[PDB]
């Protein structure tokens, strides 16, 4: 979402 990542790549 508004820069948080949940999948690494």
């Amino acid at each position: 979402k508004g820069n948080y990542v949940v999948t690494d790549h």
Partner: antibody
Amino acid sequence: QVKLQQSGGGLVKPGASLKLSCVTSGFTFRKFGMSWVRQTSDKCLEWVASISTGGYNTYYSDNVKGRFTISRENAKNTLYLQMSSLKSEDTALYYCTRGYSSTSYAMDYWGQGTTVTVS
Amino acid sequence: DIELTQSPASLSVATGEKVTIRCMTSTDIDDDMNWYQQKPGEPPKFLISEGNTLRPGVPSRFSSSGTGTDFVFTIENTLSEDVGDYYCLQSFNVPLTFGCGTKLEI
């Protein structure tokens, strides 16, 4: 079928440390981001920390940054919350939580809850 | 840090009444509003996810609508089984914030 089994709470004195654990089943664990949420004495829910699928990105509330560490071991299907320097303000029911899909930390599956009481 | 203010604080209804619980945000959340229900002494249960979609298995009597800062949760005909606390969550930005709940029927 998805299970999040939690463990590791207790009553501790201020300044103590506790390691909360969450073991999961019924899904490929590395495909999901995971989080810890805590429900305080006034039934308010408060997000504590989140970790990405590989564990390369972690987020914490300003409340716990520097005292709490979220981690996971993908091989064992478990999520941890290492809490240090426990304050009375950290008394809450801590819940292990699963992010519902790839891009969001919004939670679909919640653990049964672990009380940590600092007193 | 996006504040979410859930309203009303509490309500008591008769079964069959319609309820409306609002959740307002300080900033536009791109419709990543999510609704939870916590029945006494159970973990919160996911009712509606981002984009106002009712989750599988949640009954049709629950619905939600909302503009980027103003969202609404509705129960059309309140059944007995619906007492609990309802919470909204924005998952647009970290920190993820929650409203502090609304308790349904006492």
